[PDB]
Design a protein around this ligand. Structure first.
Ligand SMILES: C[N+]1(C)[C@@H]2CC[C@H]1C[C@H](n1cc(-c3ccncc3)nn1)C2
Ligand SMILES: C[N+]1(C)[C@@H]2CC[C@H]1C[C@H](n1cc(-c3ccncc3)nn1)C2
Lengths: 205, 203, 210, 206, 213
């Protein structure tokens, strides 16, 4: 009951008893992105759309979510609804339908102020699967990034350029030949723009 | 009218929980009742199930003495009025579609019974389904964000309840099991728990 | 004309008193009887590849609460009113063998009468478990679906019908399917999960290609 | 000067919004008109046809009247359809929930009249047999209040001719005729009349 | 150092105060006495699908919307030199720009967030998937098919909302190189029409010419 009271007090202190309005040029934020590809579900050659199921790991850190575990019964982290906090507007740049969310929208917040949010998603995106019924397979790509924040407000990075394939569905209609995730910088507008480019080579299993 | 006043007062009292923690872990019991394998798509390797899920847990903070409330021992309430566990399928390919009202039953000892009916599309190769051996598929269910140190999953039985399986389904069930699994990941010492639903079926 | 302004005032006041100055659902001590009746409009689709059939129908629901009673004389002789279904408690009447979420085809509005009775008539499209084998034959196909509370046993919600005959007077005359018979029967239903039975109304439809 | 016109509008909306629907004592008339844009498809396997149209709805409330001279000569304003009461006009033989294609915003005028024009895609019960013949196919669907009788809400049309001037010239289907006709229905049980507008469309493969 | 940390806190406080002063200290939409000009431009990303059985074609594009309100102006010097901010599109008035011949509800593909600048100008760029009325007959030809769809306010006439374009050329620099359909031309043109009614009505007409492969 004390642990419960401690956690409710912590969330009340963080969410009620102090003010974050999003990143700014004077208060920029770095968001780390990683993809865990679970399934290429469908590849449509009549419309050049491919459907992926993946987990999108998002990580950032805010001073305003920091606390001393000693003041709160040594609580070092908690889970909370993603709507309780600010989250980055990371968006697929060439989707062809609204993303469908497959998991609870809940984030893990740690006492250092770091946040980890890992929504599972089904995404339809622009992809010509020509060659998927061949040895070399097909190659397609999709960029992810902020919709409204330039690189002066949100910077992106990956922890690795190799997409996590350890959850890829063993009996998918498609096998993965390779999957990479790479930070890109592009420069109308003075400010740089950042994305992570997800590149997937695949073929019929 | 006195019973109505008592129930309204109980609910006000109770509803005026941050989730479990390592220090205050919660056990959630899970069971499945499979009603129908509706569809098996060999072009996408997606299979569609209709089932309902029994979910049960207990909170001291939902406890009350009936004698203080007209001998009310339980009530029904919107699932939005209370914390519910984030039990999720780990290999769905579409958002789950809910077939039953989001209402749970709370009992005076603090226990909660929630029974969501769902249609689920999940990753499944139906190869063999037109053969004597049939096809076999599996989908894990568990917390999305809590480890086995915060939410422990249990089952009452490893037999999926098939007593309400639709007798004229396109697919007959050869077997269906629900098995608690303890999973570890090389990075971390803490256990993760899921219930693995394994279904063997054929046309 | 001042009469009209007065009637509006009486109704806003009645609604304010009933909703703002005052139902937690039925209990064992205070159980509720819901009357159900179906009006079947159309069998839209019968899918033999998945054994799902799609129905369009109106489901009439009626119940009565003391907490919704008023004296018409205290409120300018208002004897009933329409209100959003979200303003009041409604029963969780659920198809027990749907294969998709029901789709609502009519406004979520109910009629409340001064004796505390409520009438609510949702139009729905429902996909449910049904093997249409035989539909291209003279005998046709037969399927059934139960409707009842999801969370309330017979000790909290009872159901009744006014008739066991489904109303076919609005059935679509150029449907792909003709109705041979449609019945609606109250059942006391025992589930191995639970010592207390649930009440359902069993909708049994015999139909064939027109 | 512009801040004044804005202040006037905001005050008017405030005055007006700071109505329980019609009653037999305070009944209401809704004028309905259809502008048919497209027959998108016809499914002979299910006898469902899909229409795209916008539906003009007009009614008048004393409680929405104001004097333009008291409010900077504001004669009308636009407002979210959620800020006001709107009639529960429903298709009686749809087979899927209507899909709304336009913003849910209405126009309120100083004489208390409200104009709301939802664009919709509708699937409804229709046998397209004959659509590939000179005579074409004929189908119909009634629209009316779901919960209000003719004692609370009357319906009417300005014309019985459906507006076809915006009908898609390259639709897969051409319209031979389209009418919208007020119908009154009485029943021996009940003393109250029931009103609908019957949309009748005759159409043919182009 | 501590000063850098304090600056960031100040910057956050300044933003919260700006948004507070703008929003909950104090737009009812345009009026005949206060007309608004919305600038529209399209960036066409993909013609996904052309259905000859229903004459519906599906587009993916993003639609840049821009307008300017006196009531959204502020002096940057009064707010730590903040010159613009991002905010939820639900925090502010937005124009009801609607496609006039869609056949399904538009599907939104991007975050509903806008950028507000100190001169009171607002920029909002929703990405959308749209199904609209279009006979793709000719798509399998050298000159391709031609389809058009008008965009404009649903409820405001040209008395209250005017439209303009910065160019009549649809932006094709992000068009999907491996689409099933190649673009032959794409234009966006302001029109004044009538429907009966004294008020003139304004739209922007998107005309696309495209063919297979
Ligand atoms: C159709 N049902 C499956 C019947 C009646 C409504 C729905 C849900 C009901 N129900 C109740 C329970 C239950 C209740 C209490 N404890 C364990 C299981 N499980 N399923 C049984
Ligand atoms: C595409 N429209 C049909 C144009 C512009 C937006 C939509 C709706 C508009 N509109 C206005 C009216 C109207 C307004 C006032 N009185 C009668 C009809 N009817 N349709 C005309």
């Amino acid at each position: 009951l004390h642990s419960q009271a401690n956690l409710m007090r912590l969330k009340s202190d963080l969410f009620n008893r102090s003010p974050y309005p999003g990143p700014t040029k004077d208060d920029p934020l770095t968001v780390t992105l990683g993809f865990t590809l679970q399934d290429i579900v469908k590849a449509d050659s009549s419309t050049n759309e491919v459907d992926l199921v993946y987990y999108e790991q998002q990580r950032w850190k805010l001073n305003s979510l920091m606390w001393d575990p000693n003041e709160y019964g040594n609580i070092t982290d908690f889970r909370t609804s993603a709507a309780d906090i600010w989250t980055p507007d990371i968006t697929a740049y060439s989707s062809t339908r609204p993303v469908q969310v497959l998991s609870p929208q809940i984030a893990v917040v740690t006492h250092d102020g770091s946040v980890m949010f890992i929504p599972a998603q089904r995404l339809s995106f622009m992809c010509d699967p020509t060659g998927v019924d061949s040895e070399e397979g097909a190659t397609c790509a999709v960029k992810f990034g902020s919709w409204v924040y330039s690189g002066f407000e949100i910077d992106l990075k990956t922890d690795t350029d190799q997409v996590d394939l350890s959850s890829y569905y063993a009996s998918s209609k498609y096998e993965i030949l390779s999957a990479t995730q790479t930070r890109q910088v592009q420069h109308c507008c003075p400010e740089p723009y950042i994305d992570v480019n997800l590149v997937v080579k695949f073929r019929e299993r």
